[PDB]
């Protein structure tokens, strides 16, 4: 559920993304696809939760006479009951859905890192800080090909094989 390592204050163009470091320099670059899906989903969720709470026409209070006391306590009970029900619903939905929003975001992290895992199996080495070191040279074009999900494993398979075996 909870999938966190650390945050990037320098990536200012999206919820999720990449930090690339090659011989052409380093930089932050947001993944617009997963960030976009997340914004769509969260917007629809928020709008659904809010817009379901619609309003009727009920001047709330009533004031009854001295021969309508039990009538009056019933009406105050109804007011307070609708109060408590709507308060209860709002509180619990906010709690639950904040939990679920954070968990959804964690799973988005996990899915992005899985995608980069899949494009790059043995051509790179995974690190416990949730990163990859290429066994080959990944230039800007290679980086972009990984970012838009079009990396070419056989393209660098031989170079990565050579360097990977070279480590040992």
């Amino acid at each position, epitope marked *: 559920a909870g999938f966190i390592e650390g945050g990037w204050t320098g990536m200012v163009d*999206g919820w999720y993304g990449y930090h690339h470091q090659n011989e052409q320099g380093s930089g*932050y*670059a947001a993944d617009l696809k997963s960030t976009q899906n997340a*914004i*769509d989903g969260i917007t629809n969720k928020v709008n659904s939760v809010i817009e379901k709470m619609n309003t009727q026409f009920t001047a709330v209070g009533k004031e009854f006479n001295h021969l309508e006391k039990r009538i009056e306590n019933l009406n105050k009970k109804v007011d307070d009951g609708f109060l408590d029900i709507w308060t209860y619903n709002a509180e619990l939905l906010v709690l639950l859905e904040n939990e679920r929003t954070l968990d959804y975001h964690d799973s988005n992290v996990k899915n992005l890192y899985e995608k980069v895992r899949s494009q790059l199996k043995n051509n790179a080495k995974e690190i416990g800080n949730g990163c990859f070191e290429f066994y080959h040279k990944c230039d800007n074009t290679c980086m972009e090909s990984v970012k838009n999900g079009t990396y070419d494993y056989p393209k660098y398979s031989e170079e990565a094989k050579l360097n990977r075996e070279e480590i040992d």
Partner: antibody
Amino acid sequence: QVQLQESGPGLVKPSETLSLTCSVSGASISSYYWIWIRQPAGKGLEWIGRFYTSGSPNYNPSLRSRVTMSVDTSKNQFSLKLTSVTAADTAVYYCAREEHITFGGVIVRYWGQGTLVTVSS
Amino acid sequence: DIQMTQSPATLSASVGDRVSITCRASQSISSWLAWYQQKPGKAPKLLIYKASSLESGVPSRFSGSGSGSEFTLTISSLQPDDFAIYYCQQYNSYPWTFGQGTKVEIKR
């Protein structure tokens, strides 16, 4: 409030490298992407491109190599450089700041003055 | 990438009249359209983001309705100051492209 002023020559000869400088007051360049915008005559706007200090630039696929965007964190400016300007490259230029993430995606609230670049001998 | 049809190119409408500008797209934009009021010879002013989000300081007469490929900007009561050229921007993907713009005049 952040202010963006624009400096351009006014005339660029038809086979020269246009150099434009947007000066930034009230903000640090190293913290924002910076955007260039273009308007030929009174027809439609066109997003030129985006650049960031510790990030990766992206420009219009229409204008890729000709365009190089650079940043002076010293002078608090960012410059746009266009190789081999043309008559079609005659237009108004605007520089804008790319804001950070909001719930409505990335916004461009802050806009430059607009400077005319004329490509004439 | 994404070509922009902004109809109609030129309008003239009396004061108080509702005005509707349609912005159709090449592919799917979800709700990632922006709307700018470029007054004559000035910088464009962002009217609406996220398609259905009014920016702070904008009169509530401006409303934005649409998702996917079709969108409409609607001015509830057209006022004198609302004479300008109105563009619809796309930030769903790069390159960000604008519409040709709609020229809003006022019949008097």
